[PDB]
Amino acid sequence: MTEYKLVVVGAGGVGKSALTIQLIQNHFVDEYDPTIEDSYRKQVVIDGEICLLDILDTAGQEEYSAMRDQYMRTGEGFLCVFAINNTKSFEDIHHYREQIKRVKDSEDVPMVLVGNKCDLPSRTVDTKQAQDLARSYGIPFIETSAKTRQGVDDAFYTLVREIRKHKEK
Ligand SMILES: Nc1nc2c(ncn2[C@@H]2O[C@H](COP(=O)(O)OP(=O)(O)O)[C@@H](O)[C@H]2O)c(=O)[nH]1
Ligand SMILES: [Mg+2]
């Protein structure tokens, strides 16, 4: 069966680890070592196709590790994550998209913009802002909550759909 290599990137503390653990293990972790970068694997059914997901949950401390460049070169799709209560994390998104495009040496890279923590009442990044950004990038935008599981499957599954279309060119 097809294996899709997904990489989750974003500013520290936006919920990259919580989103992945919720997707893989169906539970909300409220504190996960922020220096730990690992890979998680899950078999899922997306649009009737059985496939395997290999997800890399990046950590900022591990960026200049020997394996980061391998997982970056091997990654087919990227989840660009920000938190809706973190204005700076949203403002940083452009750096991550630029880095991925630079490494892939490609303008068109399968990507999805994710606004995490949508369960929280305090929101400093409005949905209109993220929608405008994703539309200018030509990528989907999905609101998620690792706590309540809202949008978690949709975020990862859409990235898989983005990967499939890129393959069919
Ligand atoms: N309320 C809420 N808190 C979250 C959500 N996602 C992550 N968090 C919390 O935000 C903090 C940082 O999460 P973490 O996964 O370690 O972020 P990371 O540094 O990107 O890996 C942790 O305390 C999480 O419990 C969410 O969807 N809702
Ligand atoms: Mg983490």
Residue numbers in the entry: 1 to 169
What does the paper say about this structure?
Ras proteins are small GTPases that cycle between active GTP-bound and inactive GDP-bound states to regulate diverse cellular processes. In cancer cells, highly prevalent somatic mutations that alter amino acids 12, 13, and 61 impair intrinsic GTP hydrolysis, induce resistance to GAP stimulation, and/or increase the rate of nucleotide exchange. A germline NRAS mutation encoding a threonine-to-isoleucine substitution at codon 50 (T50I) causes Rasopathy disorders. T50 is located on the b2–b3 loop of Ras between the effector-binding switch 1 and 2 regions and was predicted to activate signal output through a non-GTPase mechanism, based on biochemical and structural studies and in silico modeling.
We solved the crystal structure of K-RasT50I bound to GDP and generated a disease-relevant isogenic cell line model system for functional and biochemical studies wherein various K-Ras proteins were expressed at physiologic levels in cells lacking endogenous K-Ras. The WT K-Ras (K-RasWT) and K-RasT50I structures are very similar, with a backbone root mean square deviation of 0.7 Å between them. Isolated on the solvent-exposed side of a β-sheet, the impact of the T50I substitution on the overall structure is minimal, and a direct structural link between T50 and E37 can be ruled out. Despite substantial differences in the C-terminal hypervariable domains of H-Ras and K-Ras4b, the structures of K-RasT50I-GDP and H-RasT50I-GTP are highly similar after accounting for the expected effects of GDP versus GTP binding. K-RasWT and K-RasT50I exhibited similar intrinsic GTP hydrolysis rates and sensitivity to GAP stimulation. Accordingly, we hypothesize that a T50I or E162L mutation increases hydrophobicity at the Ras surface, thereby promoting lateral assembly through an asymmetric interaction with another K-Ras molecule and subsequent Raf recruitment and activation. Alternatively, and consistent with recently solved co-crystal structures of Ras bound to the Raf-RBD-CRD, isoleucine 50 may stabilize the interaction between Ras and the Raf-CRD at the core of the Ras:Raf signaling complex upon formation of a stable Ras:Raf membrane-proximal monomer. Specifically, substitution of T50 with the bulkier isoleucine would allow direct hydrophobic interactions with both F141 and F163 of Raf that could enhance binding.
